[PDB]
Each structure stands twice: as C-alpha cells, then as structure tokens.
Amino acid sequence: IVEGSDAEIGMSPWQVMLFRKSPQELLCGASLISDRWVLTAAHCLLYPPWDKNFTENDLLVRIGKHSRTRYERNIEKISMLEKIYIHPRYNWRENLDRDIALMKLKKPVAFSDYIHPVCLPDRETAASLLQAGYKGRVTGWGNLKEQPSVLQVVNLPIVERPVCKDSTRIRITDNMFCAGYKPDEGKRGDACEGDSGGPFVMKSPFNNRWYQMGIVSWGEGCDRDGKYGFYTHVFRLKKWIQKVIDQFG
C-alpha cells in the first residue's frame, strides 16, 4: 500500500496473507469469507507470463496477522489448502478479466478478536455503495512504493467508469472497477505489488457491516498521478462464488 497508514489491531480481521512454503515469503493478500473459505485474485495463483502456477501444497494461509514478517504466536493461525478454485473464464492473457479465486481450507479456522469473516454484497448493497466518489478501504502488506513492518490501510474513492477507461490503454470490463484520487484532488494512495488479492471493503451505512466489494487486481505502476488501481467486481462474480461454495462446501 502506498501512502497508507498502519492498521489498528483488529481493524481488518478478515485480512489473510497467502504465504509461500519455500522460499518462505509473502505471495499475496486474500480475505476470509467464512470459517473455511478464503477469497483472492486468480493471478495470485495462476499467471503464465510470469511462470506462476501454484498448487495447494505450495502455499499456506496466515489469518489474524498484523506484523508482516513476525510469527504472531497465540494470535495468528496458519491454515493448509484443501482446494483452489479459479474462475473458468479468468482472462490472464489480456486484461485480467474475472480476476478471482476461492481457496478451501483443510480445517475450519477458529474465530477470535483478530479473526473474523467479512460479508459479501447482495445486489442492493452493491447498487447502493458502488458509486463514483464513495470511498472503500484497501489493506495489505505490499510495497510501500513503486516493505512495511505491519499491515497497511488506505481509503480510496471509487472513480467514474469513463475516467477509469480514459486513464489506460487496457480494455476495461464490467467485472472491474477502479479507485483512487485524481491529481486535482490533493490526497493520494494506491495498492501496490504484494497487495494483490487483498480486499477493497466498504461499511454499509444501512446495517453497519463491512462488505467486500473488490479484490486488488492491477495497476500500471503504483500511486501514479492520472492512473488508478483496478479491482475485481465481487458482486458481478457472485453467482460463480455461490456455485463453487454450494457445490464443494
């Protein structure tokens, strides 16, 4: 995260770290959506231009974390993957369309003050919250500019789709939205390398619950003036998520 701030303890108890087994290192961000399912970006798992193709056994899930590098004894929990499910129409070849994956845990994780699932939006929450100017929150342990001691947080406004489209040469789809400040806005901030797969969340003013509206997906550079970060539109791929869980739950 660029130009963010240190998270408060328990501020993002759905935050997950995707952790490589050898060599031991941060792969990606992710989020907890129930006691056995974790949501992330497909590109965290499969990205042939970079020779990335992980299988269950290559990785661990670390939940409840705050510090990036420390083993947080008595707080974090470390989980093994039973199964990875990647969107069957994920487009890694051109624009990262449908950049989404689910991970099923071998065993359920115990909830705690530091470990708790985020909600996924229904259609009316999506309709109400996904509006230009409305701010969400992105969290991660990624690069501080184009590494932090602890989890970082930044609040960013959703940007209007024509602006999103005009800021890039990439073909933008309905399954993405972009967020970030304009040069004329003063404020700045962005996701960056390492934050991939982490959640963009919003707090519903109707029922005061946090909802994950986006997944950190791509950006040309990090916190560049005139450029925006792009997020997978979780509500738009809801059917697929429901299908996977309802079948393999």
Partner: peptide, 9 residues
C-alpha cells in the same frame, strides 16, 4: 526476512 513458522504447518 520472515520469522520461521513452526515445523508443523
């Protein structure tokens, strides 16, 4: 740069 995790896991 990461603290090692328990052997288990």
């Amino acid at each position: 740069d990461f603290e090692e995790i328990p052997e288990e896991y």
